[PDB]
Each structure stands twice: as structure tokens, then as C-alpha cells.
Design a protein around this ligand. Structure first.
Ligand SMILES: CC(C)C[C@H](NP(=O)(O)CNC(=O)OCc1ccccc1)C(=O)NCN
Ligand SMILES: [Ca+2]
Ligand SMILES: [Ca+2]
Ligand SMILES: [Ca+2]
Ligand SMILES: [Ca+2]
Ligand SMILES: [Zn+2]
Length: 316
């Protein structure tokens, strides 16, 4: 909408207060004009029609319980935009400052979030498996990263290319969580998953097997559920990424960690310069090796550590 840029205040899903960028034109809208061609947050009103209504508020204060998922979807989309711009010199998901749109209050009891090809969508959860999913900064960044992948490598959402697609979203979701620096970890979704159980998460990158996911190519899932295991076999790549950054000895193979920033540079370059829609795990290894070579040199520790990490997870 046309209006003037304003700053509202509200509370997110976890009860924390934050300022948000809004737009005033009769109402205050969840429309942040400070980033690209805007960040826009919509109310899906418990239905499945998308996007729903651009979020309108009478007083620019967002402290109602119903407001909380919108506050966080809007704010964390801004953090994710800032990460891509400031760290990777990427302007929104398309590289051209495309408007970023999210809908909250999608459906009833909906234990998931997704990118639908055009926008982000967040359920409220059923209150037992999830609380509203935009409360997780890693979740929000996972979703926006699907848009980045779709505009760049274009990894098809099936089998190994789809597991790479998933891992890219977990990797950058985690790197955004570290960028914001509030309780960062190598776990996925912990802030919104299972409110009645402390210390768990949907997936672990540091130890995927904690939640049943493979941590070695020999343990990969080969069936048809979950689009050929895209959220399962992502553990193999998540583990490799974790090892590149943090190091470790895994199935007897030692990896010297090179840190999160270099992990992010290597994988961002692989995603945007070398991967293709049908890349498999072996092709990802080659893309990561080439990316590290471009950035750090063929004889660098960074290249050596990429090779060790893929060796450790059984990907040649
Ligand atoms: C981080 C988690 C809390 C949420 C995450 N959800 P996701 O992996 O973005 C689902 N996307 C999808 O199916 O895209 C496929 C698709 C394509 C077009 C239209 C609709 C759907 C997940 O791990 N969900 C499984 N628990
Ligand atoms: Ca209000
Ligand atoms: Ca965390
Ligand atoms: Ca996390
Ligand atoms: Ca929990
Ligand atoms: Zn995903």
C-alpha cells in the first residue's frame, strides 16, 4: 500500500518485545519499506486461501496473542533479508529486491511452514507438536532460503537434489540464527517445537541421528516417503556442513573446522554458481570443493576440510 513508513512495537510468539517496520495509511500495516521492495505480512485467518489480507492494525501496537505470529514472521523476514544482503551481497530472494510476502495463521492446527512458489506460509501448530512456527528464526530463514534456492540452483524437490535443497535451507536457517545471535545452535526448530518437552528439536545438524536421520551416506533412505526422504537424507549434508564449520572426528575421519562464515561463503557460492536442478550429493561435493578453491586456493585448509567432511559422511 502507499503510505508513510512507521515503527510499531509488539511481542512475538515467545513473549519478547521487538520493534517492527510498518506503513501508515489509515491503518498501520505490516509493510516494511526499509528493505528492498518491501516485506509484507498477511493474515490467513485460519483458512487456506492465500495470501489473505495484508495485516492491518489500528494503533501500531502488536501485543495481542493473535498478533504474535505476525510480529515474528515480519521481523525475522527482515533479519533474513539483512543476512543475505550484508553477508552475501544478495538483494532479496531473486537478487533484484523482490517483495517478500508471508502469511500467518494458515489453516487450523497446522504443524508446518512452507514456501508455496511465491510466498512464505506459517501454521500456528496444534499447541503440542508446534507453537506458531514463525517464532523460530531458523524456521523463517529456512523458508526464505527455499525461495533463494528456487531462483538459483533450482534443486528439484525429490531424492538427492531435494535433500540438498533441504540441507541448504537448514544450513542458512542456522547461519541466520547465528547472525542474530540469540540462543544460536545447530538444531532446527527448537524454539517452536514441542512446548511440553525441553531440549529437543525437529532435526539436529550436529548429530542428525539423535532424531533418526542419517549421518552417513551408507544410512541413506531409499524409499518414496517424504519425496524420497528430503527431510531425512538432508542429515547427511547437514552433518558435512556442521563438520566443515566446527570440525570433529566422525566414523574415524577427522575434519578441521574452518568456522561458520567460511562455511556460508562456500555453500552460498556452490548454490549460486555450480549447483543445478538435478545435482546429486557427489555433485554437491564437487561444487563445494570448487567453491572453496575459488575462495581460498587449491592448497588451502578450507579445501582440505571440505574434502574431509564429505569423506566423513561417505560422499565421494
Ligand atoms: C523448518 C521446519 C519447521 C519446516 C519445514 N517445512 P518445509 O521444508 O519448508 C516444507 N516445504 C515443502 O514441502 O515444500 C514443497 C512445496 C512446494 C510448493 C508448494 C508447497 C510446498 C520442515 O522441515 N517440514 C517438515 N517437518
Ligand atoms: Ca494494535
Ligand atoms: Ca536456538
Ligand atoms: Ca536452531
Ligand atoms: Ca520442545
Ligand atoms: Zn524445507
Amino acid at each position: 500500500i502507499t503510505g508513510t513508513s512507521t515503527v510499531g512495537v509488539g511481542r512475538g510468539v515467545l513473549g519478547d518485545q521487538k520493534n517492527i517496520n510498518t506503513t501508515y495509511s489509515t491503518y498501520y500495516y505490516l509493510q516494511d519499506n526499509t528493505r528492498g521492495n518491501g516485506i509484507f505480512t498477511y493474515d490467513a485467518k485460519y483458512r487456506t486461501t492465500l495470501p489473505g489480507s495484508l495485516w492491518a492494525d489500528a494503533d501500531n501496537q502488536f501485543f495481542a496473542s493473535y498478533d504474535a505470529p505476525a510480529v515474528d514472521a515480519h521481523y525475522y523476514a527482515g533479519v533474513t533479508y539483512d543476512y543475505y544482503k550484508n553477508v552475501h551481497n544478495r538483494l532479496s530472494y531473486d537478487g533484484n529486491n523482490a517483495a517478500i510476502r508471508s502469511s500467518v495463521h494458515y489453516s487450523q492446527g497446522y504443524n508446518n511452514a512452507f514456501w508455496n512458489g511465491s510466498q512464505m506460509v506459517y501454521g500456528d501448530g496444534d499447541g503440542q507438536t508446534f507453537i506458531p512456527l514463525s517464532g523460530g528464526i531458523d524456521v523463517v530463514a529456512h523458508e526464505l532460503t527455499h525461495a533463494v534456492t528456487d531462483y538459483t540452483a533450482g534443486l528439484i524437490y525429490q531424492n538427492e537434489s531435494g535433500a540438498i535443497n533441504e540441507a541448504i535451507s537448514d544450513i542458512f536457517g542456522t547461519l541466520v540464527e547465528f547472525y542474530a545471535n540469540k540462543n544460536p545452535d545447530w538444531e532446527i526448530g527448537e524454539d517452536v517445537y514441542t512446548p511440553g518437552i525441553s531440549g529437543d528439536s525437529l532435526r539436529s545438524m550436529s548429530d542428525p541421528a539423535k532424531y533418526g536421520d542419517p549421518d552417513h551416506y551408507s544410512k541413506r533412505y531409499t524409499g518414496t516417503q517424504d519425496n524420497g526422504g528430503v527431510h531425512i537424507n538432508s542429515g547427511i549434508i547437514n552433518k558435512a556442513a556442521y563438520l566443515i564449520s566446527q570440525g570433529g572426528t566422525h566414523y574415524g575421519v577427522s575434519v578441521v573446522g574452518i568456522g561458520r562464515d567460511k562455511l556460508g561463503k562456500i555453500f552460498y557460492r556452490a548454490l549460486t554458481q555450480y549447483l543445478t536442478p538435478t545435482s546429486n550429493f557427489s555433485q554437491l561435493r564437487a561444487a563445494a570443493v570448487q567453491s572453496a578453491t575459488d575462495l581460498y586456493g587449491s592448497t588451502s585448509q578450507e579445501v582440505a576440510s571440505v574434502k574431509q567432511a564429505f569423506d566423513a559422511v561417505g560422499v565421494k
